[PDB]
Amino acid sequence: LLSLPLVGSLPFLPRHGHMHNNFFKLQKKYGPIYSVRMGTKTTVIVGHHQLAKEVLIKKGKDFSGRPQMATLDIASNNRKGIAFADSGAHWQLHRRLAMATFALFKDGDQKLEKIICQEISTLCDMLATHNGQSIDISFPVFVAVTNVISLICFNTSYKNGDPELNVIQNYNEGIIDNLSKDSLVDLVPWLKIFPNKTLEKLKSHVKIRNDLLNKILENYKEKFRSDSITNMLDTLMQAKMNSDSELLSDNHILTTIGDIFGAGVETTTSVVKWTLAFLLHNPQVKKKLYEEIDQNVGFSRTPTISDRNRLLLLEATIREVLRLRPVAPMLIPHKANVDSSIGEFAVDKGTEVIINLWALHHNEKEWHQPDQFMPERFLNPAGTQLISPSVSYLPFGAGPRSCIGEILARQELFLIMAWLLQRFDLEVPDDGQLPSLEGIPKVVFLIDSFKVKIKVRQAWREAQ
Numbered sequence: 092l093l094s095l096p097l098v099g100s101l102p103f104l105p106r107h108g109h110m111h112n113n114f115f116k117l118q119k120k121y122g123p124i125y126s127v128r129m130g131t132k133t134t135v136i137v138g139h140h141q142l143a144k145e146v147l148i149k150k151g152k153d154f155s156g157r158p159q160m161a162t163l164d165i166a167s168n169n170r171k172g173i174a175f176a177d178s179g180a181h182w183q184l185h186r187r188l189a190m191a192t193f194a195l196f197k198d199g200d201q202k203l204e205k206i207i208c209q210e211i212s213t214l215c216d217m218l219a220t221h222n223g224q225s226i227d228i229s230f231p232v233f234v235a236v237t238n239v240i241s242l243i244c245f246n247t248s249y250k251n252g253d254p255e256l257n258v259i260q261n262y263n264e265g266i267i268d269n270l271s272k273d274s275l276v277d278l279v280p281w282l283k284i285f286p287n288k289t290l291e292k293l294k295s296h297v298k299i300r301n302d303l304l305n306k307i308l309e310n311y312k313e314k315f316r317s318d319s320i321t322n323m324l325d326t327l328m329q330a331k332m333n334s335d336s337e338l339l340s341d342n343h344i345l346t347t348i349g350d351i352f353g354a355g356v357e358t359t360t361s362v363v364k365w366t367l368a369f370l371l372h373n374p375q376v377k378k379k380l381y382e383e384i385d386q387n388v389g390f391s392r393t394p395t396i397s398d399r400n401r402l403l404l405l406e407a408t409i410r411e412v413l414r415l416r417p418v419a420p421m422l423i424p425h426k427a428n429v430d431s432s433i434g435e436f437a438v439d440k441g442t443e444v445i446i447n448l449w450a451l452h453h454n455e456k457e458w459h460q461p462d463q464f465m466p467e468r469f470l471n472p473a474g475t476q477l478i479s480p481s482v483s484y485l486p487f488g489a490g491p492r493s494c495i496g497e498i499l500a501r502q503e504l505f506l507i508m509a510w511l512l513q514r515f516d517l518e519v520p521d522d523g524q525l526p527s528l529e530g531i532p533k534v535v536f537l538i539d540s541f542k543v544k545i546k547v548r549q550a551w552r553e554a555q
């Protein structure tokens with residue numbers, strides 16, 4: 092007897108468990124870095140913080156490419172924009188101009204905190220009308236963060252009830268659903284093996300997004316003034332005006348805006364939902380957050396960015412959400428721009444390189460009870476200082492492809508949660524259902540929809 096000819100072998104079953112956890116589980120057997128080959132393409136998975144910092148920082152510019160994928164081509168109008176653009180002149184310029192835009196929001200009256208706090212004030216007024224009811228907070232949050240990013244991109248915001256917000260919500264959901272079935276990392280290219288309409292559906296969602304962004308962009312050509320640079324579109328059109336010209340085509344500007352607009356809405360809304368869900372599961376933590384805000388902010392005023400110096404448990408809670416349920420548990424796929432190496436192992440040019448951030452955030456040697464939600468791990472024993480308990484922590488990535496929206500994200504998350512906790516009791520709905528914390532890996536790590544009972548806090552009422 093003889094062993095069977097083997098035509099293919101994969102180390103775990105496809106579509107069974109979360110990909111980021113399956114890869115992590117493999118490290119027990121093969122170590123923290125290993126490879127898989129599908130047809131002619133090789134993918135390397137990295138699951139230890141030293142190798143990841145080599146890829147992202149030390150040799151960051153060797154591994155700053157993006158792999159090409161059929162779905163990503165459609166969302167990115169063929170690898171324009173930032174997030175899905177390959178390393179190259181177009182990416183570098185648009186990333187730099189996007190980053191420079193955030194500097195226009197450093198100080199003054201258009202300061203970032205002021206834009207955020209005004210949209211949070213409307214959100215809170217809206218939620219307060221639901222006093223005593225159980226609601227899904229997704230859309231009210233989505234609206235506030237959509238208005239924040241719309242103001243950053245264009246200096247415009249949507250009035251309550253504007254049907255465009257429902258149009259955007261609809262295509263956002265459709266693009267996320269069709270961009271990947273689970274994570275962006277897939278061992279088997281199912282799209283190309285069996286007949287399906289995934290690409291056709293994605294194109295129809297992206298066409299609506301593109302048509303909407305095209306209308307704004309064209310209408311803005313009439314408003315743009317060399318003498319007034321106050322938002323992201325101004326910044327891009329100024330660079331075009333002073334132009335390289337080919338790298339700032341209308342389609343290039345549109346896709347970069349769509350990347351910022353899309354990232355500014357989906358990332359922040361998801362993290363807010365996760366934070367509320369963990370707090371419904373951990374009432375002891377929620378109780379201490381009320382005490383911390385009642386003692387440090389009170390009700391004389393609304394929370395401010397400066398309050399990050401005092402609401403330490405709230406900052407730790409957010410840090411712990413981003414550790415336990417990272418927005419991007421495998422970042423976005425990287426690619427070797429040149430022949431290089433990771434941990435002394437050769438990596439050819441063109442190899443896809445995946446950083447398993449989940450593995451970094453759940454490494455047993457780097458963290459105590461990594462499966463557990465414990466905001467106190469980011470505080471000292473007294474609870475008087477924030478600490479960095481581990482170097483194996485990279486929620487925003489690092490190096491050339493690191494998140495450019497980090498400052499916005501941290502301010503939005505902190506302010507939304509501080510305003511909500513000052514004003515609202517947030518409780519399990521009356522049928523006793525808790526949110527599932529298992530999550531749904533998509534291009535972003537989403538949580539299942541859930542309801543929360545909302546009540547205006549008595550302490551707030553008494554104080555008015």
Ligand code: HEM
Pocket residue numbers: 173174175186350351354355356358359362413417418419422423424486487488489491492493494495496497499500
């Ligand atoms: C909690 C919220 C967020 C987290 C945890 C987060 C994290 C990350 C991560 C892990 C990456 C990929 C790093 C890599 O591929 O190596 C990334 C990239 C990126 N993020 Fe975020 N992000 C957040 C919110 C935002 C926001 C609010 C925006 C825009 C306002 C934004 C814009 C981007 C862009 C454009 C990229 C692509 C960078 C590039 O490829 O050059 N992100 N982010």
Ligand SMILES: C[C@]12CCC(=O)C[C@@H]1CC[C@@H]1[C@@H]2CC[C@]2(C)C(c3cccnc3)=CC[C@@H]12
Pocket residue numbers: 166174262263264266267270300349350351353354357358418419494534535
């Ligand atoms: C797909 C989506 C949302 C849906 C939509 O309408 C189109 C839009 C296109 C841009 C996408 C965006 C989803 C988050 C992305 C992938 C992102 C990101 C990811 C994780 C952390 N930070 C940022 C940067 C690019 C963003």
